[PDB]
């Protein structure tokens with residue numbers, strides 16, 4: 001059923017809460033035993049948001065391999081994403097270790113460091129060229145190379161150095177800075193513009209490791225970004241775009257990380273983004 005008609009039918013009937021709860025009911029439940037070990041309590045931002053054991057990213061170290069991060073592997077769409085929490089004061093070195101080990105080209109940040117007057121993630125990248133950051137626990141150096149500030153997002157070029165080998169890589173930081181403190185954006189136009197800037201960079205392409213995507217918990221805004229990208233890609237490669245089922249794509253993605261899309265308003269916003277984005281994909 002053409003999702004644009006499914007959309008008007010749910011909107012006229014005001015059933016968004018009902019659709020959303022049906023997804024919550026059918027979603028996968030897999031063990032997260034590593035996340036709940038007592039040694040890992042200060043590596044989790046939220047007690048109720050954990051990576052499944054089967055899909056968690058492992059750090060390459062014998063001490064403790066744990067980070068709150070999941071690999072979302074979309075077989076047909078041929079896309080992979082790492083979804084993670086906003087880094088904590090004691091996990092900023094783990095965060096950059098993961099970007100290095102997984103060969104990521106891009107980091108996508110969908111939150112501000114402070115929202116609603118509280119800290120939602122650590123200040124984990126340098127704000128000035130001449131003040132680099134050293135992560136002594138993981139042996140990495142991070143330098144700000146350049147910054148491009150736009151009305152709805154900022155793009156940064158960063159240099160990450162493995163201090164053990166003196167290899168360096170360019171990482172691109174895509175920072176969406178205008179998601180409102182409450183609710184979802186009124187129009188998806190600026191979110192789609194941002195998505196298209198990340199795609200244009202190469203950060204989502206198979207020649208690199210998976211893109212790292214985060215917000216505060218790494219399930220709500222982060223879920224909206226990967227759901228929209230995957231649905232638009234499937235509309236492109238398929239003979240019949242109309243066969244793309246957003247609810248089924250979301251349930252597939254929830255096999256790899258719990259809780260993706262946190263509210264009925266985030267579900268409706270995801271539909272709006274895919275419907276408006278398709279008017280490019282289908283040749284405009």
Ligand SMILES: O=S1(=O)c2ccccc2[C@@H](O)CN1CCO
Pocket residue numbers: 074076077230234243244245246248249250251252253
């Ligand atoms: O490729 S999907 O994301 C996809 C695409 C279009 C319609 C439905 C679906 C779902 O089955 C989940 N997917 C993989 C498992 O089948």
